[PDB]
Amino acid sequence: GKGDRRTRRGKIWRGTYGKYRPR
Amino acid sequence: PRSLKKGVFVDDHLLEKVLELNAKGEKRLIKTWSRRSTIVPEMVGHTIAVYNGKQHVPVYITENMVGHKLGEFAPTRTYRGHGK
Amino acid sequence: MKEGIHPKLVPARIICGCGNVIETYSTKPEIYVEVCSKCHPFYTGQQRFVDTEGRVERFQRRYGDSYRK
Amino acid sequence: TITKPVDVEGKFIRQTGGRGQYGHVKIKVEPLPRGSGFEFVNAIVGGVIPKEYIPAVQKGIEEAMQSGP
Amino acid sequence: PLDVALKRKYYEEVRPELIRRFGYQNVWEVPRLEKVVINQGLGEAKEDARILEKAAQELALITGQKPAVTRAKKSISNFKLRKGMPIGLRVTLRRDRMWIFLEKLLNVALPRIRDFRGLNPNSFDGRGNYNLGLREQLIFPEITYDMVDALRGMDIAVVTTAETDEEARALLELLGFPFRK
Amino acid sequence: ARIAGVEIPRNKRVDVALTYIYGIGKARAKEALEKTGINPATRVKDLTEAEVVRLREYVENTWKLEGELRAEVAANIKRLMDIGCYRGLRHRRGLPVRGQRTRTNARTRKGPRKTVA
RNA sequence: CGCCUCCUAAAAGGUAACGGAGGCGCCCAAAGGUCCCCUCAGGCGGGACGGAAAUCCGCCGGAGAGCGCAAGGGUAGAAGG
RNA sequence: GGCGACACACGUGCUACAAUGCCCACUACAAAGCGAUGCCACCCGGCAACGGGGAGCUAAUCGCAAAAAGGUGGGCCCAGUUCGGAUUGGGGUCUGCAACCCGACCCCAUGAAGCCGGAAUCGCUAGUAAUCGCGGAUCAGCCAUGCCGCGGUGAAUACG
RNA sequence: GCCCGGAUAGCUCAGUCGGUAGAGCAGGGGAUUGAAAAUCCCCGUGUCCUUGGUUCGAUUCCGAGUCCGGGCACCA
Ligand SMILES: [Mg+2]
Ligand SMILES: [Mg+2]
Ligand SMILES: [Mg+2]
Ligand SMILES: [Mg+2]
Ligand SMILES: [Mg+2]
Ligand SMILES: [Mg+2]
Ligand SMILES: [Mg+2]
Ligand SMILES: [Mg+2]
Ligand SMILES: [Mg+2]
Ligand SMILES: [Mg+2]
Ligand SMILES: [Mg+2]
Ligand SMILES: [Mg+2]
Ligand SMILES: [Mg+2]
Ligand SMILES: [Mg+2]
Ligand SMILES: [Mg+2]
Ligand SMILES: [Mg+2]
Ligand SMILES: [Mg+2]
Ligand SMILES: [Mg+2]
Ligand SMILES: [Mg+2]
Ligand SMILES: [Mg+2]
Ligand SMILES: [Mg+2]
Ligand SMILES: [Mg+2]
Ligand SMILES: [Mg+2]
Ligand SMILES: [Mg+2]
Ligand SMILES: [Mg+2]
Ligand SMILES: [Mg+2]
Ligand SMILES: [Mg+2]
Ligand SMILES: [Mg+2]
Ligand SMILES: [Mg+2]
Ligand SMILES: [Mg+2]
Ligand SMILES: [Mg+2]
Ligand SMILES: [Mg+2]
Ligand SMILES: [Mg+2]
Ligand SMILES: [Mg+2]
Ligand SMILES: [Mg+2]
Ligand SMILES: [Mg+2]
Ligand SMILES: [Mg+2]
Ligand SMILES: [Zn+2]
């Protein structure tokens, strides 16, 4: 679901972080 | 959009040209090149000439246009249509 | 009027959302409702609910007079 | 000589087995102030028609000018 | 008849307000509601599922009154329209039931319209009567979601003894007809 | 048309049932089941009119949704159009707004390919 | 090539030409009997989708509508619905 | 200002069309490189982008650093959906003189096409294909889904 | 001039006795070729000759015109 920035999966793909992938 | 940390951006070689008229004598033709300039509250009601790579475009300014630049009101590519 | 074919209208009880009670008549003698006339934003003065937005656009934008002269 | 500028096409395409033949040219032609001469503008953009096929596409417009309609 | 809220409001609160405003010299000269007539303009009942007594339960529940069918006056090509074709339901409301419908029309339904910016302050007959056009029918209190099969709006004709728009305006106003502008 | 202007799909959880409304995404379905205090793993059908009205008043009052949100959206677009800026010009024609390329692709802002002879 | 309608036909009837124009060789079990009840086209204003024209409300409208089909006569104080 | 145009046509790719699937939380196992106006621990602030601090390291020292798929349990139950993430609205974060043309990133709302693709046609013979993530060159930033490298899990078939 | 018939897609022709029209070829998109044919997958599309009329509606039914094909103009 990698074009989905609204998720872990999609934020890993783009290699970023946020509320949706917290570090 | 820019980072609010900094103050909004205006070339300062134009805003001097926005304010000097308000107290000297409003107004004549302001021929600019700074398409990058946020539209200031003090510009409103004025006529300024935004360049588009060849031609100085007349842009009269209203209280519904301010946040956007001077470049949004002078497109550079001239298109018309296709296959007409 | 004509028998057999008309929905019988009876003493009815419409309860709205804002706790509003109306005492009209109907074909269903108790009825429950979303929004109405003692609550709808157009009916109670000027409740813009959330959005007195308004013409904040534009130059309320100020922020600020932060350019030298 | 003519009495109103026109824009026309010339499609010489004969493809039916290798044999060849493709020659395509669209032009504008207008009447000059009399006494002028023959004016020829290579307003071809890029190589849409290759450089080599332009000497002999004047020599074809030029040749067929020897006899008016 | 029977005691009903919007009627009491007409007689003991709406009348005298008017009587002031326009200075009528006679108790009959003073605006009354003549009748209210609802009409599903319809025609989706042409060559398609012709029988829609479904709509006529929709009205039926709204008004407490079963509507009459309107048949096609003249045949028409471009509307897929054969003369004699049922192309609309129509119901004529007077007296108590007019009051009752109008009662719930204003206390409930027009609010229950999405995007309700208020009734058109221009829809006036030129001779004292007024018209509003509705877009669907869940709008009304007794019409639910698990009953609908389609979205049939309707026309509403509010017909009145006023001789001028001015007087008509005042009347409907006083009863609480929301006038956008 | 219970909450808000659109009735919600029973049998399916509420934290998505409220996403089945224009203007309300999963993070807003997130914050409204903690602020009106209803368990998110209960269906629309296993409610009481208590939970319903707490939800309906809360949801409807806080933000703006449905036609009104739409109203302001297109209005925002309309003003952008009216001036009229680049950001609005590309609403006039039907070409991308956010600075795209269109030589190929762009088939959503443009739709069905108008194949040309 | 028979039959119908109008004109020619000279204000009764009738009246010709390879004179001017059109129609008929059907139809309808209701499109018949009778009782009862309704009145049109069109114009303007009003009204969701709905448009020149669908259906709805108002005002004006003596007949210009309708009368299965040509035309003519007739016709709402009905022959119309 | 343009090389980012858009009626259109082709190439190579990414991401999908779901249940051997997708989300949320808990817990594991890589390599190869990179890093002194560079890498940034941990602490706090904000849902976050990031910002204010601030320890250590010219680095088999400190770091970038979680690898991901997977394993444990729970949630959705075949729906254009808790598949899909395009497009659009508003608000933000950093680079940089400046983000309109024309930047990446975050969050809020939007939740399109796409139900496995005509004719045609590519790759692959084993740690290969397939799938999963990491690094670097370039570089202020990044339009990388590109490129060159890294390891994780790990097939099928070859009569002829 | 008289009699019959015909005008429907770029071309050559089906069809309609009333509502939304077809074939072959040419033309357009793509596949195939080093390339051009040939082949393969998709394509569309006409105010159905002009005019007047009957119909709610006409390519269609009725009158007329035009151009075209056929035939006849004899005793003289
Ligand atoms: Mg995948
Ligand atoms: Mg100042
Ligand atoms: Mg040869
Ligand atoms: Mg009016
Ligand atoms: Mg009146
Ligand atoms: Mg939603
Ligand atoms: Mg006589
Ligand atoms: Mg006699
Ligand atoms: Mg005679
Ligand atoms: Mg009869
Ligand atoms: Mg009779
Ligand atoms: Mg009878
Ligand atoms: Mg009339
Ligand atoms: Mg009208
Ligand atoms: Mg309709
Ligand atoms: Mg008559
Ligand atoms: Mg006839
Ligand atoms: Mg440039
Ligand atoms: Mg380029
Ligand atoms: Mg393609
Ligand atoms: Mg790519
Ligand atoms: Mg959907
Ligand atoms: Mg689909
Ligand atoms: Mg999703
Ligand atoms: Mg934006
Ligand atoms: Mg920029
Ligand atoms: Mg989804
Ligand atoms: Mg499926
Ligand atoms: Mg698949
Ligand atoms: Mg396949
Ligand atoms: Mg080999
Ligand atoms: Mg990488
Ligand atoms: Mg981009
Ligand atoms: Mg032909
Ligand atoms: Mg036709
Ligand atoms: Mg005709
Ligand atoms: Mg002889
Ligand atoms: Zn209420």
Side-chain angles (χ1 to χ4, degrees), chain C residues 1 5-9 14 22-28 31-37 40 42-43, chain E residues 2-3 60-61 63-66 97 100 103-104 106-108 111 116 118 141-142 178 180:
Chain C
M1 335 116 106
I5 49 154
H6 290 301
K8 216 188 54 129
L9 268 161
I14 303 186
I22 321 122
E23 299 216 67
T24 177
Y25 296 56
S26 199
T27 32
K28 301 198 192 71
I31 260 180
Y32 302 106
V33 165
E34 348 84 82
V35 359
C36 93
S37 64
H40 184 271
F42 185 79
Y43 270 82
Chain E
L2 36 89
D3 166 36
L61 290 193
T63 85
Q65 203 170 302
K66 191 203 70 59
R97 296 185 292 276
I100 292 171
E103 170 129 292
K104 317 174 289 221
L106 299 149
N107 280 332
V108 173
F116 196 71
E142 47 280 294
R180 123 153 47 75

Side-chain angles (χ1 to χ4, degrees), chain E residues 127-129 160-163:
Chain E
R127 212 101 43 167
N129 335 269
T160 228
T161 102
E163 289 190 348

Side-chain angles (χ1 to χ4, degrees), chain D residues 5-65:
Chain D
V6 230
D7 191 325
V8 283
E9 306 194 15
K11 290 177 185 179
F12 192 45
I13 119 180
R14 277 186 179 174
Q15 316 180 307
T16 53
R19 311 165 195 187
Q21 251 113 237
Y22 195 45
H24 184 55
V25 137
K26 295 179 190 166
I27 77 291
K28 290 166 159 59
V29 207
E30 332 167 37
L32 247 32
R34 306 164 202 184
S36 292
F38 171 58
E39 208 63 85
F40 177 65
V41 275
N42 184 13
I44 244 294
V45 46
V48 169
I49 303 177
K51 317 95 198 80
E52 310 76 72
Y53 295 154
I54 288 284
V57 81
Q58 168 181 73
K59 186 182 172 182
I61 275 182
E62 223 175 3
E63 195 169 308
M65 259 178 65

Side-chain angles (χ1 to χ4, degrees), chain F residues 47-56 58-99:
Chain F
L47 301 192
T48 67
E49 243 84 54
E51 302 159 79
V52 177
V53 301
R54 259 186 282 146
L55 250 183
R56 191 223 265 78
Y58 181 87
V59 163
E60 292 198 49
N61 288 272
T62 332
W63 321 282
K64 77 155 58 178
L65 355 155
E66 299 287 4
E68 173 189 18
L69 223 216
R70 280 183 251 261
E72 189 194 334
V73 170
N76 287 11
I77 307 187
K78 184 61 163 88
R79 186 197 107 251
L80 277 163
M81 242 188 313
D82 287 316
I83 23 188
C85 46
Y86 190 86
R87 214 156 75 80
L89 260 180
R90 323 297 291 174
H91 278 98
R92 288 185 189 174
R93 284 198 181 104
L95 290 164
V97 170
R98 314 183 193 257

Side-chain angles (χ1 to χ4, degrees), chain C residues 34 40, chain E residues 39-42 44 105 109-111 113-116 118-119 132-140 148 150-156 180, chain F residues 1 5 67-68:
Chain C
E34 348 84 82
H40 184 271
Chain E
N39 166 260
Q40 302 257 231
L42 267 26
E44 23 259 64
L105 173 77
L110 292 152
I113 286 188
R114 81 192 74 232
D115 330 327
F116 196 71
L119 305 168
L132 59 137
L134 268 50
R135 77 164 112 61
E136 10 149 339
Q137 89 257 25
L138 294 86
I139 287 69
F140 299 82
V148 62
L151 302 190
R152 283 107 32 170
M154 68 182 59
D155 284 330
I156 322 194
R180 123 153 47 75
Chain F
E68 173 189 18

